[PDB]
C-alpha cells in the first residue's frame with residue numbers, strides 16, 4: 001500500500017494478523033528467540049538489547065533507576081532501552097513489564113491502593129475497575145506499558161505469604177474482581193472473541209492474569225509448593241477466574257512456580273497448551289515467572305538445558321530469564337538447531353508476542369508520553385484509593401457488651417485523644433509488601449498519609465491529639481484522654497518470607513492494645529494481609545477494625561472511624577479460631593469459624 005520502500009508490518013492501517021504474519025516471515029531464528037527473551041533492566045545495555053534482539057524488559061521488585069526517581073527519570077530510562085530496540089534491523093519495540101499490583105507501587109510518589117484482600121472486602125467490582133484505570137495512567141506516567149496484574153489466586157490457606165494478593169478464598173469473588181483487567185487495558189469491543197488479547201491504546205497497559213494455576217491451593221500455604229487436588233477441584237476453585245480473564249481479553253498469562261499433583265506448572269503441557277491455549281482459546285502470550293523454568297528441577301538451575309526444553313515444549317512463549325540471557329538464548333538456539341524444539345513452537349510463541357505488541361499499539365507509540373508524567377500520584381487517584389481503603393475496612397466489634405454505647409463513630413471534637421501503636425504512624429507498614437521494595441519496608445517510604453496524620457487532619461481544631469507509639473498503662477490512665485485509636489499488626493512481607501505457620505502478630509502489639517484499652521475506651525485498627533489470631537485483641541478492645549493493608553491514603557481509615565461514612569466491608573475470607581483448624585474455607589464440612597466469610601458489622605454516617 002503505496003511508497004516504494006513499503007513494509008506491510010510497519011503500516012498501522014493493516015489488520016493485526018496480517019502485520020504479525022508479515023513480520024514473522026522476515027525474522028531470523030536469532031530475532032525470533034530474541035522476542036521470547038525478557039531481561040532485567042539491571043542487565044540491559046543498548047548493545048545487549050540490539051545484539052540479542054531482546055523482546056522485553058522488566059523491573060523486578062525494587063528494580064528502579066534510583067531511589068526517589070521522578071516519573072520523567074523512569075520515562076527516560078524506558079525510552080533509552082526502547083531506542084536501542086528500535087535500532088535493530090527490524091525495529092521491533094520492546095515491551096516493559098512491572099509489578100503494578102496495588103498502584104504503580106515500585107515508584108516513589110505513586111498512589112498506593114489497598115491490597116487485593118481488602119478490595120475483596122468491598123464486594124465492589126466497579127471500584128476495582130476504576131482502580132485499574134487509575135493504575136494504568138500511573139504506569140504510563142513512568143513510560144511502562146505492561147503490568148503483572150491481576151493476581152487471581154484463590155488463597156485457600158492464609159498461612160501463605162501471598163494471601164493478601166488474593167481477593168478471596170471464594171472463587172466467585174475473585175471472578176467478580178477480574179474487572180481490574182478492562183480497567184487496566186480498556187473495555188473490549190462489542191463483538192469480542194474470548195481469549196483474544198486487547199489493549200485500547202497508549203493510555204492503557206497490557207495486563208497479566210497470574211499465576212496459572214492453583215497458586216493459592218498449595219499444601220499448608222507453602223509458597224511455590226504443591227497443590228494437591230483432583231481435576232474437578234482445580235477446575236471448580238482455581239481455574240474459573242481465568243475464563244473470565246479470557247472473556248475480558250487479558251493480554252498475557254504468567255505461569256505459577258507451584259506444582260499440581262507433583263507436576264511443575266512451568267513444565268505442564270496438558271494445562272498450558274492443552275487447556276489454556278487449546279480449550280480456553282487464549283491467543284495472547286504466556287510468560288514464565290522469575291527463574292520459573294530454573295525451578296522445574298531440584299535443585300533449581302541444575303539442568304538449564306532441560307528447563308528450556310521442558311518449558312518451551314509445555315507451551316510457554318516468553319521467558320522471564322531474567323539475568324542469564326546469553327545462556328538462555330544459546331541453549332534454545334541449540335535445541336532448535338538440533339530438532340529438539342520444532343520451528344512451529346518458536347513461530348507460535350513469536351506470533352503471540354507480536355500479536356500483543358501490535359494489538360496494544362506498541363509499534364505506533366513505542367516511546368513514553370511526557371505529558372503523562374503528571375498522572376503519578378494525582379489527587380484524583382488518591383481520592384479513589386481513599387474511597388477503596390474506607391470500603392475495605394471490616395468492623396468486627398463495636399462495643400464489649402450488647403448494652404454498651406457503640407464506640408464508633410467517634411466524635412471529632414474532644415478535649416484530648418490518644419493515637420498509639422506501632423502501625424499508627426508508619427506508612428510502609430500500612431502499605432505492606434510490594435511497596436517500593438518487594439518485601440515492602442518501614443517508615444516514610446513514599447508519599448502518603450499515616451493514620452496519625454489522618455486523625456490530625458480530621459479532628460476539630462480544639463481537639464488535642466497525642467501520639468505515643470507504645471505507652472504504658474499509667475501514661476494512658478493519667479492522660480485525660482476521651483478515647484484512643486490504637487493501630488497494630490503485621491510487618492510487610494511477600495512470598496516465602498510471608499509464609500507463616502502461627503499467624504500471631506509481632507509484639508509489642510497486643511501489649512500496647514492491652515495497656516491503652518485498660519485505661520480508656522479504644523478503637524483498635526488491625527493492619528494485616530490476612531486473618532491473624534485475634535481473640536486476645538478482641539477481648540481488650542471496645543471496637544476493632546480489620547483494615548487489611550490499606551495503602552497510602554490513611555484518611556480512608558478515619559473517614560469510617562469518625563463517621564463521615566458508614567462501615568460496609570464484609571470479610572472476603574474465613575476468620576479462623578485457631579491455626580490448627582487450617583485449611584478451613586466456607587462450604588467445608590467442619591466449618592467452625594470465629595467469623596464466617598461475609599461477616600461485617602455496620603455503622604451509619606454522621
Ligand SMILES: CO[C@@H]1O[C@H](CS[C@@H]2O[C@H](CO)[C@@H](O)[C@H](O)[C@H]2O)[C@@H](O)[C@H](O)[C@H]1O
Nearest residue numbers: 059060061062063099148210289290438495
Ligand atoms: C527483584 O526481583 C525479584 O522479585 C522476585 C519476586 S518473585 C516473582 O517475581 C515476578 C517479577 O517481579 C512477579 O511478577 C511474580 O508475581 C513473582 O512470583 C523475588 O523472587 C526476588 O526476591 C526478587 O529479586
